[PDB]
Design a protein around this ligand. Structure first.
Ligand SMILES: Clc1nc(OCc2ccccc2)c2[nH]cnc2n1
Ligand SMILES: Clc1nc(OCc2ccccc2)c2[nH]cnc2n1
Ligand SMILES: Clc1nc(OCc2ccccc2)c2[nH]cnc2n1
Ligand SMILES: [Mg+2]
Ligand SMILES: [Mg+2]
Ligand SMILES: [Mg+2]
Lengths: 233, 233, 233, 233, 233, 233
């Protein structure tokens, strides 16, 4: 076992979809998987194993923030032998290159965290996803007719930012959106030789203040779920 | 409502106990409170309001890590008008002065996070609790005959540490244990002029290699919980 | 001996009151102690041993700035076996919560120094006083009818600040006043397992530009001296 | 004209290959291009324009180190309207996954430079290439039967390193090799909204202690050069 | 008057010798100057004005550490119109090129302080003396037959060091000795457009373990003192 | 050999003049040296050995930026046994104390590079030239009737600065001009126990926007060349 997961070793398939919100994980298990079994529930952070088009797939919640994400991803890789980790979530757009309902593939994750300096010699770690996984996402999106937006995201320790004046500067350097875990997902997978990728759905635009209707939010997140499950099968 | 709490304004009493684990919050509501009502459940992060010896008290989960804690504490203060926040968490002992299941009161919370440098001019913010709450904790512990251990804690972005060499230095500087939220609780309550304190029970021990099960991390710490409820009565 | 103190080992009592100004130390020895003996005078930095209400008490000057304070405190603890160190001084108020003649108890000391990053793994050390000593100060102040103001102070390397625009931000985070040694006193005592506390008297308000009359400055500092000597006896 | 390029505006095609060594640039012009013309030679840093299979392609030297690279890339983009920049450099292998003369495509460029902290709010900029160019490189390599190694590189300010202990950690985090310009190329192209990619051939090997001669660093990498020209056709 | 000097404006000559120890300043006044008058004594930090071979020269103590030194130097320049400041201090040798009682002239002062990063855009300020004063020191030493050692010093916030491993690296980079004020003297005089130089005599030796008594640190360095007075005549 | 120099060991004289621009090195060899032999040309970075007034002197190009300069200087010292390195170049004035055509002697080199923090314990290295060499430059300039301007320079990683608002602050702290290599030259020579000095010619004033005519630029650089060759003979 671990302190944060009470699944049996072997309960997880080697491919795992992750979301910060464990109720979104539950929703995916119930709506999209066949024969879905809840396999962990410590701290109400739910994980499941089921089948998608006959393919075994696991789902796991990771909470909010780099430190929370790093706990679960570390345990999934080191204890539960998970090999491929696809994070899907929402993000707040900061770039004119993206709009509401877009799906972003993060080919880099910048951060205001100290975690990668602590990991990496007090230097600048370029936190990046597995290239083959990003290729698979691109080819699957084209097959599904999804216009995948590709660029960096900014992973913040702050949901309520003290640096909103800086969003334009991040957009200048090709940061399409802000979220709070990708840099930790990527650095952990890099450390532990696992394949990881982050996709995020634009439900809010932090510049133009636009926001999706609650029904639209379900629809756009559903399209992201289908993309994720298709690239893992 | 906030993006992470779906309570109505006014559902929270001005005094609130916090745990990272919403199931420890649920345990406390069911075991120790009268007329307890679940008031929020976004992302499965439960919160409750109820009575202890006729006094209204709220409970709220804050998830794992400074970024998660800061989100919930910020919303509790600014939207739900919470005035006193008492974290009753778990921690890993690094000092030979403390043992498994000891209760520590954090007179300061050091950190490897960048959040306080971002908050505070890139200088050293010494994150500290409210002194009146600390005095109340000390006096209540004396009244109840509880041996309260008092010192700093170190709040890390890492549970699985890359600086295991460094725990002895931490302990030398009177850090009794490591956990992952106190510095964020303290800095947020400082920012927002609210009263906060962190108590934690030792669930893991660097020196003895003891570690509690997930069930024990919920159920083994009634002495902490009773201390907290008695402080807020 | 040491390079900076020429007292005999054993000349110091285990409890020592400190001030930056050695002439203030001399004043205390002459006005408040019985049988006071000058025991060190290297670099004109005077220290004394005498009796207060039959209690042996030492006094020692520590100069200005964290680096100066750290030299004397290190020597007092390691060579002269001093166990409890109470620093009293003036400070410049930056918070609307305090006014001229207030006495502040510093339960944390933030800093713009690099000293604690050098001491503490390049992380954020929360520099804090000994809790039991702060309890003793609080109980003694209540016995004497002193309205003790409690909060953080900011210990600066700069008397003539280049960051005056930032005072409001420090006051927001519960820094009541600025001085130049507390963070070094606290970190040194933490390193060396000694008990330390800092009190400071508000003789100037850096925001409202108010300032005490020279006679008022003597009176307010006298009240602080009495509080200190009473808590050590 | 610019202080470092004496070409006429319009002399550069929109697609440009880059090497740190202007004599590798000269070699490519003479060996692989039709109707090649030298278009700039300030500071002996040569650049050319010519044709490959009827398609116009430019070549430009960028010197050694991030500061040198940033100068030339900034001018190529802002003054000479270059749109796509493909570095084909050399690097020192630090990972057992790669061997001498292997071709690496840098999916990210970590660094010990301060340039990106200066650019990017003192946070961590994850310096990354254009994804479309990366896909083009991958697909062209597959078409040509070239075994393209894919991972991060570490861009250092040092060729003769003071952190030789640290190469193993770099390699653990999937840094295949060390070189000295990719992070600057990537950050400058991000700043200026241009498409950039870095390929490098292994000219030195940490583990085997192999190292090529200066002549071999010009002449030994035709497979890299052909990959690059085929990508831009 | 200033908070730390109670001289009248005009009491200081434009040329001033500085020591950290006010009793070394007093020693110089009594032993080497004609008609010496004590002009300031706040906090027992003495200063004098007198004549050497008919030329007016002032002396002033600056206490221990960069923060203390910066206070006195700032006031001497801005209020008392001092133009040339010559520190004649003590230092701990870390290089085998120097021996006990050697006189070092600090061509640069490296530091572990944050003060210069705070002053200077968070970049590296290379703190250096006035070149004309350095030339004067060199030429006067030659004239007097004094073997002046020339190199960098390292100005630390610590006398009792936590980086004893690091002294050999310091010495490799031509740091002959460690002391605690030169970088602050140099940075303050740079800020304020005044001429400053630091000479120091070796009072402690890392390699031989030699260390002088407090009395010897006042009385053993007449050769330094005579060099300084001859330079300012 | 080395990767970046193809001269024979022994081809270099122990005294070497350096410039960033290898065509300026060529110009010096052709116009001012007797019997000049080109001895290296890797990457078109030319170096020469010849005679000046019967004195053997070498010349070597070092490219732009600290990282480039550090490669060549390291190789010159460690492989080719060069003992004295005099860098001459142009610089952009930022101080009212200097004007067009002035020659500056840099007695310190500040920087925005991370290189000296990486070299030097994450502290502040005061990067300084060899004092005897600076003496020789001063005495030679006086003999030649040159009004040598003496002060710090600022060595930047950025030719196209993002911090132009800060030039006035650097001028305040006695930075007379900006260039891009001196801090690296100085730190490398300090590490490796070689004698180094940087002179620079003011061809542009970055404040007043003044600029020398192309013919004046040749004349002023010629005067600097003569000063350099005279101090090495
Ligand atoms: Cl960071 C952290 N680490 C824990 O245990 C692991 C550990 C134990 C000893 C030394 C260092 C780390 C915790 N147990 C409860 N909260 C915790 N937070
Ligand atoms: Cl920084 C750098 N170092 C190289 O080789 C030296 C080396 C080899 C192995 C480990 C570390 C350093 C390079 N070869 C081509 N470009 C290079 N850039
Ligand atoms: Cl920081 C300092 N340390 C001294 O001696 C202790 C020492 C000796 C050798 C290596 C390191 C530290 C001094 N003696 C006079 N001024 C001094 N400043
Ligand atoms: Mg989400
Ligand atoms: Mg005082
Ligand atoms: Mg030049």
């Amino acid at each position: 076992m671990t302190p944060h997961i009470n699944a049996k070793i072997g309960d997880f398939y080697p491919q795992c979809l992750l979301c910060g919100d464990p109720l979104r994980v539950s929703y995916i298990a119930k709506k999209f998987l066949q024969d879905a079994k809840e396999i962990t529930n410590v701290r109400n952070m739910l994980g499941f194993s089921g089948k998608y088009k006959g393919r075994g797939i696991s789902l796991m919640g990771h909470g909010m923030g780099i430190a929370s994400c790093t706990i679960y991803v570390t345990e999934l890789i080191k204890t539960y032998q998970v090999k491929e980790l696809l994070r899907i979530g929402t993000c707040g757009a900061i770039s004119p290159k993206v709009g509401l309902k877009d799906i972003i593939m993060a080919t880099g994750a910048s951060t205001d965290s100290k975690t990668n300096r602590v990991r990496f010699l007090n230097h600048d770690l370029s936190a990046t996803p597995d290239f083959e996984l990003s290729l698979r996402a691109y080819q699957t999106a084209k097959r599904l007719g999804i216009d995948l937006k590709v660029g960096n995201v900014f992973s913040s320790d702050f949901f309520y930012s003290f640096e909103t004046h800086a969003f334009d500067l991040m957009a200048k350097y090709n940061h399409l959106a802000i979220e709070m875990e990708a840099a930790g997902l990527y650095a952990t997978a890099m450390e532990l030789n696992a394949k990881a990728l982050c996709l995020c759905s634009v439900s809010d635009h932090l510049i133009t203040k636009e926001a999706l209707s609650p029904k639209e939010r379900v629809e756009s997140f559903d399209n992201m779920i289908i993309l994720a499950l298709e690239m893992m099968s």
